[PDB]
Design a protein around this ligand. Structure first.
Ligand SMILES: Nc1ncnc2c1ncn2[C@@H]1O[C@H](COP(=O)(O)OP(=O)(O)O)[C@@H](O)[C@H]1O
Ligand SMILES: [Mg+2]
Ligand SMILES: [Mg+2]
Ligand SMILES: [Mg+2]
Length: 1286
């Protein structure tokens, strides 16, 4: 391709088949059911290259080779109608940014931009023009993509547009009527008092406002930005209120300032951590050292509700992406550690799996369904968390949509506009918690990706480029790692409002002003107006202030990490903001700072209280037996595997407690626990409390239950003082809707003035979304879908001992199951899982019955966690005591024999109430002392003995001589799994979804088990470490690598001197491989896996003659070792032509499941010449798996038979039974003969997909036997490396 494109050339290069077997079969099945007779369909990826200069033969062959990737699926000769799906014109895709990155790092600077599209070849025959639009409609996303009829039509994606001029609003010429026209035209949605201020301010300044100044003002004075509702004065029932909603949340800090370092001063909150060894690479030596200093914990939770309703993937991705920015931009620089994902939607209504409570109430044409949000949403959120490298450790998922009789009578209550919750923790240094002072003349920089026209359904469609944020994070990292030499004076994140809010906020919080230059900002689309360059909500951008003489240091750091930066302005003494344009010689902005932060009348909400009545439960169709079946089928209660395994849970190697529990990997962990470092047992803990449907009956109860559930979910961890637990209050409501407003005040008062100050719980952070409703026309009537007052409390805490955390995993040993019913026998059935499941709302809901007992409960729980008196713990949340005992039996793979006689005469209420508390398991001999301890905290009238956990499959609930409920634990396990099975069927490979489900039906599954061939505690590297001689290992990384710090910590424990070797360090000629005898290619998402996972990394070595030679000399040397875990396994398997004895090596392509697999799979060490696996052969241990492209692919059977004969296989996936299996998920990728590790003939180079570096510590394993020391068996790989070098 060299078809006419201005001064540039557009090149058409073919690619591999885009869709695999089942995807094509699903498309054909989707066409049939729409009366579109399509015989066959074939999809093919096709690349488009915009070249600025010419391309020679060597360079042409190099471009063709970069674009050869993915699964080697059989290609078809194009036949039928061509339908090309490319992104919408004027839009650059995340693929395009990352693929072009590779071209530039491979020496092909002639390439301006690289875009991909999917060519569909439809053999349908005889379809009217209408039916063709229907076919095209099913092949693209109307919000992001467009359909073309020719491959040459893709020229529209690269059009050069002339920079648009600044428009002026003629206030001085047309009057106030010019601002009324601008408020309508530009879409500023300002109030009357706001337009009044804008009239006066510009009459004072005596000039016409530019469209840019007006748009900036709108973004700065929107309700969300200024937090109008939260700062507003209130009048409840004709009675004026003393405090505001924000001031009531601040009361929790005034009554409990304990352990808080920063609150309401940043875009996150900081609390006290522990003095642990912070591990990183020294700025001078390049060596990774342990820095013994206080590692303080930071936290923040965000929402991105409306964007998720329009486009799920971007809404969820940028939701976690903006939150990751809030964390990194805390103080003078911080580092994100772990994260939490949350969701609330309407009824799923899965085709062929409709539930008895689900009814179609319609939905706006403009928004997407609850099911589409649950397919594409979790994937987008996980895509960011996976590609950036932060583990998604805990969370919630709730479904609600019903014609309920609430506060405003009978109406539809649900979430058509969902709650997309994204949050997490991070670590920060003590001298970086506080924001530094901005000096006059401080250079104001924009760290991050080149802007595009994103924030202006269409304008609600976002963009996620997570590798860009990794690079940005690595710059923030090198900065706080410099100690007191940290260049960053002040750092703020970019988000709502774009640069128009971020910059005037950076200087304002510093007390300074600022002079900018529009042409110094990095732009990816030239045609933008000054309005668009400054007000666009483009992602992965940060704003920062750095001293003038610290600029050469910032440049050196950014270029080495490949993170784009641009100095756009200077900080000024005078409180004034100004933007300059060098292209037009004018000044787009010229305003005093107060003119922007300009106030008008403070909001006053004079509201009335409304209260629901709601009748008692109609128990006609309710039988305890059907109630159990119906409850376990409610998405809120049901297994959450489809939300857990799609997101990384093992990165940083600091993960102690992930969602998956026990040998059976059941996702029932109540909270998430991470270790503070890689050298301690101190840590962080995360939990979520939320009970939104209760706000339909009692507003104050739902709020209190959210604080209560967060506390009960956190209770199994060794925290100590309750004042150590810090809360985050995210409020979701529909402000204006009858009764919600007055009910928001009572809910904020209930937690802010009453419950939290009484327990000692601080709320140092929060956020608000105040328009949770959707309106549309159904027939001729208007329908509304209003959300309940949804409070999502996220509890954060410092851990004293990571090892002492309890899980729902029951022990079959002599035991006693004791229930702590904090509900005091109230047994409330209103607004429960049971009620919803039977299309009802109920009578009276659950609540914190006694404040002193909820505190007493926690203190008692802590007393038992420290004294090691508990065997297991699980709290009562959704679906009551039944679901708690069921989920405990699922995790323990055992039986339960309980008696609920002393729990009232109402058995349905005793089993299904969502009151606080739960079930603790103790040793039989310890029953008396534990009851006595629980009595010391005044909980004797709450503690009821239930029964015991028995070995078996029987789940029995009795009441004296009578049998209340008896069923097979496996039947309940499978029923509870049915929702995730169905979600994986429509999203992943149905073959894989079915195999995962059908393995749960086998009660004979022994779970993950261990077989060891060597001594796990024998440190064979000890005589070597004792000499003091520490050999150096090149811990290799490319832009987008995240699993390198723990890889360095693994070799360090073995006795190595781990050094940070970036690819830029080799390409820039700073570091050479000659001084090394050991190299390790690390894991991550280099280039966001674009152009094939690990292919861009390998080709930047291969095409660069100097670096290519540097690597070949390394592998060809007699005494060198090399490791390639994940990503780096994919990189090294693409470097075959450089490594000796790697002729028979396979490739690692997309998983058979077509999904990212974050598993804890069981492998076995097979006989291979591998020098890193010596002494380990025959062993069977669980390993950390986190990959989406790890399937071993051979060219034919000759390649596989030859690989097996040469004996190059090191690790194979085995099921829990012990045999080599190709069944999912025991084998997560679908690799032939279970391969995930191969080696060379000499055995010096070994590549593997699993992560031994993320699990080198026993506490870092999701499951491990209760006798294992500090080291896991995987610590031997690194020690074998030390003994081999001598
Ligand atoms: N959206 C999500 N993303 C990741 N994990 C989730 C999500 N939703 C739920 N989980 C996990 O599934 C498990 C059970 O969830 P759930 O029963 O709703 O929590 P709870 O224990 O408070 O009742 C937990 O381990 C939780 O962290
Ligand atoms: Mg919950
Ligand atoms: Mg729970
Ligand atoms: Mg639950």
């Amino acid at each position: 391709g060299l078809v006419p494109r201005g001064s540039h050339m557009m090149e058409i290069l073919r690619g591999s088949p885009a869709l695999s077997a089942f995807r094509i079969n699903k498309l054909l099945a989707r066409f049939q059911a729409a009366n579109l007779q399509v015989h066959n369909i074939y999809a093919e990826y096709v690349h488009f290259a915009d070249l600025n200069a010419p391309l020679n033969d060597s360079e042409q062959a190099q471009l063709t080779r970069l674009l050869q990737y993915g699964p080697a699926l059989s290609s078809h000769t194009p036949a039928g109608k061509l339908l090309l799906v490319t992104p919408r014109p004027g839009t650059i895709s995340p693929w395009s940014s990352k693929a072009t990155d590779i071209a530039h790092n491979c020496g092909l600077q002639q390439v301006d931009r690289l875009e991909r599209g999917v060519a569909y070849y439809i053999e349908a025959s005889t379809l009217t023009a209408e039916q063709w639009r229907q076919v095209a409609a099913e092949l693209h996303d109307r919000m992001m993509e467009t359909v073309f009829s020719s491959l040459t039509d893709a020229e529209k994606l690269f059009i050069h547009h002339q920079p648009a001029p600044v428009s002026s609003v003629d206030l001085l010429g047309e009057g106030r009527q010019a601002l009324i026209d601008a408020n309508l035209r530009l879409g500023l949605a300002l109030a009357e008092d706001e337009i009044d201020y804008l009239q006066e301010a510009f009459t004072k300044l005596g000039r016409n406002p530019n469209d840019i100044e007006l748009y900036m003002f709108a973004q700065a004075n929107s309700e969300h930005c200024r937090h109008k509702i939260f700062n507003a004065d209130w009048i409840i029932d004709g009675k004026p209120q003393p405090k505001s909603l924000f001031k009531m949340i601040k009361n929790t800090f005034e009554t409990t300032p304990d352990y808080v370092l920063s609150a309401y001063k940043d875009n996150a909150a900081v609390m006290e951590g522990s003095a642990v060894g912070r591990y990183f690479a020294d700025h001078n030596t390049g060596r990774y050292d342990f820095h013994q200093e206080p590692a303080h914990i930071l936290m923040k939770v965000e929402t991105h509700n409306h964007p998720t309703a329009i486009s799920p993937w971007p809404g969820a991705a940028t939701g976690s992406g903006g939150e990751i920015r809030d964390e990194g931009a805390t103080g003078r620089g911080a580092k994100p550690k772990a994260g939490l994902v949350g969701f609330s939607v309407s009824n799923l209504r899965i085709p062929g799996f409709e539930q008895p409570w689900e009814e179609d109430f319609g939905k706006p044409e403009r928004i997407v369904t609850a099911l589409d949000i649950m397919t594409e949403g979790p994937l987008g959120g996980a895509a960011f968390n996976n590609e950036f490298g932060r583990p998604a450790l805990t969370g919630y998922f709730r479904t609600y949509e019903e014609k309920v009789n609430s506060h405003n009578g009978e109406e539809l209550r649900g979430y058509h506009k969902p709650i997309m919750l994204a949050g997490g923790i991070g670590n920060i240094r003590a001298d970086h918690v506080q924001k530094g002072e901005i000096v006059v003349g401080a250079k104001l920089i924009v760290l991050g990706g080149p802007a595009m026209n994103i924030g202006l359904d269409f304008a609600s469609v976002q963009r996620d480029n997570p590798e860009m944020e990794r690079r940005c994070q690595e710059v923030i990292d090198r900065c706080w790692q410099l100690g007191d030499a940290n260049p960053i004076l002040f750092i703020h994140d970019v988000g709502a409002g774009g640069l128009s809010n971020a910059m005037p906020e950076l200087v304002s919080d510093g007390g300074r002003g600022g002079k900018f230059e529009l042409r110094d900002i990095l732009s990816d689309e030239p045609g933008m107006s000054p309005l668009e360059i400054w007000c666009n909500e483009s992602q992965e951008r940060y704003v920062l202030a750095v001293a003038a003489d610290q600029l050469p240091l910032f440049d050196e750091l950014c270029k080495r990490e490949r993170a784009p930066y641009a100095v756009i302005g200077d900080a000024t003494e005078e409180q004034h903001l100004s933007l300059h344009d060098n292209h037009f010689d004018n000044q787009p902005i010229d305003l005093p700072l107060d003119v922007l932060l300009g106030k008008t009348p403070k909001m006053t909400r004079d509201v009335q209280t409304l209260k629901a009545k709601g009748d008692a439960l109609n128990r006609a169709d309710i039988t305890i037996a059907d109630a159990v079946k119906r409850v376990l089928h409610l998405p809120t209660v049901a297994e959450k595997t489809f939300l857990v395994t799609i997101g990384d849970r093992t990165v940083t190697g600091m993960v102690a407690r992930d969602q998956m529990v026990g040998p059976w990997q059941v996702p029932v962990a109540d909270c998430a626990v991470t270790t503070a470092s890689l050298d301690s047992y101190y840590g962080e803990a995360m939990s979520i409390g939320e009970r939104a449907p209760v706000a339909l009956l009692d507003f104050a109860a739902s709020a209190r239950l959210a604080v209560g559930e967060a506390l009960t979910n956190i209770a199994a961890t060794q925290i100590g003082d309750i004042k150590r637990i810090k809360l985050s209050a995210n409020w979701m409501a529909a402000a204006g809707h009858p009764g919600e407003d007055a009910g928001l005040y009572d809910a904020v008062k209930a937690v802010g003035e009453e419950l939290c100050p009484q327990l000692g719980l601080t709320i140092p952070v929060g956020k608000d979304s105040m328009s949770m409703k959707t309106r549309w026309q159904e027939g001729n009537e208007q329908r509304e879908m209003t959300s309940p007052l949804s409070l999502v409390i996220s509890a954060f805490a410092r851990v004293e001992d990571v090892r002492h955390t309890l899980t729902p995993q029951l022990s079959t040993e002599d035991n006693a199951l004791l229930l702590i019913d904090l509900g005091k026998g109230h047994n409330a059935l209103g607004a429960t899982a049971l009620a919803q499941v039977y299309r009802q709302l109920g009578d009276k809901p659950a609540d914190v019955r006694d404040v002193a007992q909820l505190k007493g409960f926690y203190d008692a729980m802590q007393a038992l966690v420290a004294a090691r008196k508990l065997l297991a713990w699980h709290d009562r949340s959704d679906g009551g005591l039944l679901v708690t005992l069921a989920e405990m039996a699922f995790a323990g793979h055992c039986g339960v024999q309980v008696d609920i006689a002393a729990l009232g005469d109402d058995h349905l209420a005793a089993l299904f109430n969502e009151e606080l508390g739960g079930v603790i398991q103790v040793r039989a001999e310890d029953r008396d002392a534990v009851e006595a301890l629980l009595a010391q905290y005044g909980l004797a009238d709450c503690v009821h003995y239930l029964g015991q956990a028995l070995a078996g499959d029987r789940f029995v609930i009795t009441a004296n001589d009578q049998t209340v409920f008896s069923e097979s634990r496996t039947t309940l396990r499978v029923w509870w799994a049915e929702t995730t099975w169905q979600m994986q069927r429509l999203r992943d490979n149905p073959q894989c979804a079915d195999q995962e489900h059908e393995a749960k039906a086998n009660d004979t599954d022994p779970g993950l088990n261990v077989k060891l061939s060597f001594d796990i505690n024998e440190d064979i590297a000890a005589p070597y470490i004792a000499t003091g001689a520490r050999p150096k290992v090149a811990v290799l990384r490319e832009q987008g690598v995240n699993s390198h710090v723990e890889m360095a910590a693994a070799f360090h424990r073995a006795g190595f001197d781990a050094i940070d070797v970036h690819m830029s360090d080799l390409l820039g000629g700073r570091i050479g491989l000659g001084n090394f005898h050991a190299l390790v290619a690390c894991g991550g998402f280099s280039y966001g896996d674009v152009l094939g996972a690990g292919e861009g990394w390998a080709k930047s070595i291969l095409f660069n003659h100097r670096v290519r030679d540097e690597f070949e000399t390394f592998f060809h040397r007699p005494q060198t070792l090399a490791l390639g875990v994940c990503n780096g396994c994919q990189m090294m398997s693409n470097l075959r032509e450089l490594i000796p004895g790697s002729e028979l090596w396979p490739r690692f392509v997309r998983n058979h499941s077509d999904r990212f697999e974050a598993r804890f799979s069981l492998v076995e060490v097979t006989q291979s010449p591998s020098l890193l696996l010596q002494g380990m052969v025959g062993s069977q241990m669980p390993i950390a798996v986190s990959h989406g492209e790890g399937r071993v692919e051979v060219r034919d059977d000759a390649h596989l038979a030859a690989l097996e004969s040469k004996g190059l296989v090191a690790l194979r996936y085995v099921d829990n039974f012990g045999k080599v299996t190709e069944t999912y998920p025991a084998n997560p990728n679908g690799s032939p003969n279970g391969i995930t590790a191969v080696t060379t003939e000499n055995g010096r180079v070994t590549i593997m997909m699993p992560h031994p570096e993320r699990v080198f510590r026993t506490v870092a394993n999701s499951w491990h036997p209760e006798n294992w020391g500090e080291d896991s068996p995987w610590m031997r790989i690194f020690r074998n490396a030390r003994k081999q070098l001598g």
